[PDB]
Scaffold this motif. Structure first.
Motif, PDB file in Angstrom:
ATOM      1  N   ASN A 187       0.826  -1.201   0.000  1.00 37.60           N
ATOM      2  CA  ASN A 187       0.000   0.000   0.000  1.00 37.60           C
ATOM      3  C   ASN A 187       0.864   1.256   0.000  1.00 37.60           C
ATOM      4  O   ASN A 187       1.536   1.560   0.987  1.00 37.60           O
ATOM      5  CB  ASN A 187      -0.929   0.005   1.215  1.00 37.60           C
ATOM      6  CG  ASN A 187      -1.853   1.209   1.235  1.00 37.60           C
ATOM      7  OD1 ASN A 187      -1.654   2.172   0.493  1.00 37.60           O
ATOM      8  ND2 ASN A 187      -2.872   1.160   2.085  1.00 37.60           N
ATOM      9  N   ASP A 188       0.841   1.984  -1.112  1.00 33.72           N
ATOM     10  CA  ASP A 188       1.621   3.209  -1.239  1.00 33.72           C
ATOM     11  C   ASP A 188       0.707   4.429  -1.300  1.00 33.72           C
ATOM     12  O   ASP A 188       0.168   4.762  -2.356  1.00 33.72           O
ATOM     13  CB  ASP A 188       2.496   3.153  -2.492  1.00 33.72           C
ATOM     14  CG  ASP A 188       3.535   4.258  -2.522  1.00 33.72           C
ATOM     15  OD1 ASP A 188       4.073   4.596  -1.447  1.00 33.72           O
ATOM     16  OD2 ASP A 188       3.810   4.784  -3.621  1.00 33.72           O
ATOM     17  N   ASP A 189       0.536   5.093  -0.160  1.00 33.13           N
ATOM     18  CA  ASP A 189      -0.313   6.276  -0.088  1.00 33.13           C
ATOM     19  C   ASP A 189      -1.750   5.934  -0.470  1.00 33.13           C
ATOM     20  O   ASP A 189      -2.382   6.644  -1.253  1.00 33.13           O
ATOM     21  CB  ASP A 189       0.226   7.373  -1.007  1.00 33.13           C
ATOM     22  CG  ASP A 189      -0.547   8.669  -0.876  1.00 33.13           C
ATOM     23  OD1 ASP A 189      -0.650   9.188   0.256  1.00 33.13           O
ATOM     24  OD2 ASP A 189      -1.052   9.167  -1.904  1.00 33.13           O
ATOM     25  N   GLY A 190      -2.260   4.841   0.087  1.00 37.48           N
ATOM     26  CA  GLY A 190      -3.617   4.423  -0.209  1.00 37.48           C
ATOM     27  C   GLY A 190      -3.775   3.917  -1.630  1.00 37.48           C
ATOM     28  O   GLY A 190      -4.891   3.835  -2.145  1.00 37.48           O
ATOM     29  N   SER A 191      -2.659   3.576  -2.269  1.00 34.56           N
ATOM     30  CA  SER A 191      -2.685   3.078  -3.639  1.00 34.56           C
ATOM     31  C   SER A 191      -1.929   1.756  -3.751  1.00 34.56           C
ATOM     32  O   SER A 191      -1.147   1.400  -2.871  1.00 34.56           O
ATOM     33  CB  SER A 191      -2.078   4.111  -4.591  1.00 34.56           C
ATOM     34  OG  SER A 191      -3.088   4.833  -5.272  1.00 34.56           O
ATOM     35  N   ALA A 206      -5.990  -2.462   4.198  1.00 30.55           N
ATOM     36  CA  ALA A 206      -7.069  -2.390   3.220  1.00 30.55           C
ATOM     37  C   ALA A 206      -8.320  -3.097   3.730  1.00 30.55           C
ATOM     38  O   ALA A 206      -8.280  -3.796   4.742  1.00 30.55           O
ATOM     39  CB  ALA A 206      -6.621  -2.994   1.897  1.00 30.55           C
ATOM     40  N   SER A 207      -9.429  -2.910   3.023  1.00 30.26           N
ATOM     41  CA  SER A 207     -10.692  -3.531   3.406  1.00 30.26           C
ATOM     42  C   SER A 207     -11.441  -4.044   2.181  1.00 30.26           C
ATOM     43  O   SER A 207     -11.312  -3.493   1.088  1.00 30.26           O
ATOM     44  CB  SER A 207     -11.564  -2.533   4.171  1.00 30.26           C
ATOM     45  OG  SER A 207     -11.008  -2.239   5.441  1.00 30.26           O
ATOM     46  N   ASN A 208     -12.228  -5.103   2.377  1.00 24.78           N
ATOM     47  CA  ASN A 208     -13.012  -5.708   1.297  1.00 24.78           C
ATOM     48  C   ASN A 208     -12.230  -5.747  -0.015  1.00 24.78           C
ATOM     49  O   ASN A 208     -12.614  -5.115  -1.000  1.00 24.78           O
ATOM     50  CB  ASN A 208     -14.330  -4.950   1.100  1.00 24.78           C
ATOM     51  CG  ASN A 208     -14.159  -3.445   1.183  1.00 24.78           C
ATOM     52  OD1 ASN A 208     -14.517  -2.822   2.183  1.00 24.78           O
ATOM     53  ND2 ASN A 208     -13.610  -2.854   0.128  1.00 24.78           N
ATOM     54  N   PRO A 259      -8.398  -8.784 -15.240  1.00 27.21           N
ATOM     55  CA  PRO A 259      -8.569  -8.932 -13.790  1.00 27.21           C
ATOM     56  C   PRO A 259      -8.055  -7.721 -13.019  1.00 27.21           C
ATOM     57  O   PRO A 259      -6.849  -7.556 -12.834  1.00 27.21           O
ATOM     58  CB  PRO A 259      -7.739 -10.175 -13.448  1.00 27.21           C
ATOM     59  CG  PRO A 259      -6.781 -10.325 -14.579  1.00 27.21           C
ATOM     60  CD  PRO A 259      -7.496  -9.809 -15.793  1.00 27.21           C
ATOM     61  N   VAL A 260      -8.978  -6.875 -12.574  1.00 31.43           N
ATOM     62  CA  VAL A 260      -8.619  -5.677 -11.824  1.00 31.43           C
ATOM     63  C   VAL A 260      -8.953  -5.831 -10.344  1.00 31.43           C
ATOM     64  O   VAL A 260     -10.089  -6.140  -9.983  1.00 31.43           O
ATOM     65  CB  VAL A 260      -9.340  -4.432 -12.373  1.00 31.43           C
ATOM     66  CG1 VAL A 260      -8.806  -3.170 -11.715  1.00 31.43           C
ATOM     67  CG2 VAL A 260      -9.196  -4.356 -13.886  1.00 31.43           C
ATOM     68  N   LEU A 261      -7.956  -5.614  -9.492  1.00 33.64           N
ATOM     69  CA  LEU A 261      -8.142  -5.727  -8.050  1.00 33.64           C
ATOM     70  C   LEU A 261      -8.493  -4.375  -7.441  1.00 33.64           C
ATOM     71  O   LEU A 261      -7.702  -3.433  -7.497  1.00 33.64           O
ATOM     72  CB  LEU A 261      -6.877  -6.285  -7.394  1.00 33.64           C
ATOM     73  CG  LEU A 261      -6.931  -6.403  -5.869  1.00 33.64           C
ATOM     74  CD1 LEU A 261      -8.176  -7.163  -5.434  1.00 33.64           C
ATOM     75  CD2 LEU A 261      -5.676  -7.087  -5.346  1.00 33.64           C
ATOM     76  N   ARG A 262      -9.685  -4.284  -6.861  1.00 33.67           N
ATOM     77  CA  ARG A 262     -10.145  -3.044  -6.244  1.00 33.67           C
ATOM     78  C   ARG A 262     -10.379  -3.232  -4.748  1.00 33.67           C
ATOM     79  O   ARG A 262     -11.006  -4.203  -4.325  1.00 33.67           O
ATOM     80  CB  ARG A 262     -11.433  -2.564  -6.916  1.00 33.67           C
ATOM     81  CG  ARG A 262     -11.197  -1.606  -8.071  1.00 33.67           C
ATOM     82  CD  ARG A 262     -12.406  -1.532  -8.990  1.00 33.67           C
ATOM     83  NE  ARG A 262     -12.357  -2.544 -10.042  1.00 33.67           N
ATOM     84  CZ  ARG A 262     -13.123  -2.519 -11.131  1.00 33.67           C
ATOM     85  NH1 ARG A 262     -13.996  -1.536 -11.313  1.00 33.67           N
ATOM     86  NH2 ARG A 262     -13.015  -3.478 -12.039  1.00 33.67           N
ATOM     87  N   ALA A 263      -9.873  -2.295  -3.953  1.00 29.54           N
ATOM     88  CA  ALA A 263     -10.029  -2.356  -2.505  1.00 29.54           C
ATOM     89  C   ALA A 263      -9.673  -1.022  -1.857  1.00 29.54           C
ATOM     90  O   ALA A 263      -8.784  -0.311  -2.326  1.00 29.54           O
ATOM     91  CB  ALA A 263      -9.170  -3.471  -1.929  1.00 29.54           C
ATOM     92  N   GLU A 264     -10.369  -0.690  -0.775  1.00 28.16           N
ATOM     93  CA  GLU A 264     -10.123   0.557  -0.060  1.00 28.16           C
ATOM     94  C   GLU A 264      -8.821   0.482   0.729  1.00 28.16           C
ATOM     95  O   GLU A 264      -8.713  -0.271   1.697  1.00 28.16           O
ATOM     96  CB  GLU A 264     -11.287   0.870   0.881  1.00 28.16           C
ATOM     97  CG  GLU A 264     -12.622   1.013   0.169  1.00 28.16           C
ATOM     98  CD  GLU A 264     -13.677   1.674   1.036  1.00 28.16           C
ATOM     99  OE1 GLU A 264     -13.714   2.922   1.078  1.00 28.16           O
ATOM    100  OE2 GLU A 264     -14.466   0.944   1.673  1.00 28.16           O
ATOM    101  N   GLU A 298     -10.312   4.440  -2.358  1.00 29.33           N
ATOM    102  CA  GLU A 298     -10.544   3.280  -3.211  1.00 29.33           C
ATOM    103  C   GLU A 298      -9.391   3.086  -4.191  1.00 29.33           C
ATOM    104  O   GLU A 298      -9.164   3.916  -5.070  1.00 29.33           O
ATOM    105  CB  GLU A 298     -11.862   3.440  -3.975  1.00 29.33           C
ATOM    106  CG  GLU A 298     -12.893   2.376  -3.636  1.00 29.33           C
ATOM    107  CD  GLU A 298     -14.286   2.743  -4.109  1.00 29.33           C
ATOM    108  OE1 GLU A 298     -14.548   3.949  -4.304  1.00 29.33           O
ATOM    109  OE2 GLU A 298     -15.115   1.824  -4.284  1.00 29.33           O
ATOM    110  N   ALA A 299      -8.669   1.982  -4.034  1.00 31.23           N
ATOM    111  CA  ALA A 299      -7.543   1.677  -4.905  1.00 31.23           C
ATOM    112  C   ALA A 299      -7.900   0.570  -5.890  1.00 31.23           C
ATOM    113  O   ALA A 299      -8.635  -0.359  -5.554  1.00 31.23           O
ATOM    114  CB  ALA A 299      -6.329   1.279  -4.079  1.00 31.23           C
ATOM    115  N   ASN A 300      -7.378   0.675  -7.108  1.00 33.06           N
ATOM    116  CA  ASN A 300      -7.646  -0.319  -8.140  1.00 33.06           C
ATOM    117  C   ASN A 300      -6.391  -0.604  -8.960  1.00 33.06           C
ATOM    118  O   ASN A 300      -5.807   0.302  -9.554  1.00 33.06           O
ATOM    119  CB  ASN A 300      -8.782   0.155  -9.055  1.00 33.06           C
ATOM    120  CG  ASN A 300      -8.347   1.237 -10.027  1.00 33.06           C
ATOM    121  OD1 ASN A 300      -8.380   1.045 -11.242  1.00 33.06           O
ATOM    122  ND2 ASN A 300      -7.936   2.381  -9.494  1.00 33.06           N
TER     123      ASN A 300
END
Length: 108
Positions: free
Chosen positions: A43-47, A59-61, A73-78, A88-90
């Motif tokens: 996790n780099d600055d919420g990214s 991160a969550s969910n 395949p895109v990974l998305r998570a807060e 929200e990071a993707n």
């Protein structure tokens, strides 16, 4: 690039950290392989960051969803940034995820 997604089957995520996909080698057969993001992505600055680790630790969910007409395949998570307030990071696994001899590898 991570064409492995186009040459792999059963692309998804487990518990938001374990990756599974059947990548072939070239002879014509498939090879079930998996990759751990908890030790490859961080996790780099919420990214999302390629080559990090413990990304889920803040991160969550975390789940993987398909995006685009090519099925990427895109990974998305807060993610939780150092500044404050999670964002929200993707990240598209196909961005730096390949398949060597059917085995899951990372673009380094």
């Amino acid at each position: 690039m991570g064409n492995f997604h186009e040459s792999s089957n059963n692309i998804w995520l487990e518990d938001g950290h374990i990756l599974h996909a059947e990548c072939g080698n070239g002879e014509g057969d498939y090879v079930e392989s998996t990759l751990d993001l908890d030790y490859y992505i961080g996790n780099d600055d919420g990214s999302f960051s390629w080559g990090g680790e413990n990304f889920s630790g803040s991160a969550s969910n975390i789940t993987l969803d398909i995006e685009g007409d090519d099925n990427i395949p895109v990974l998305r998570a807060e993610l939780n940034p150092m500044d404050g307030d999670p964002v929200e990071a993707n990240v598209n696994l196909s961005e730096r995820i390949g398949n060597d001899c059917g085995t899951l590898i990372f673009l380094a």
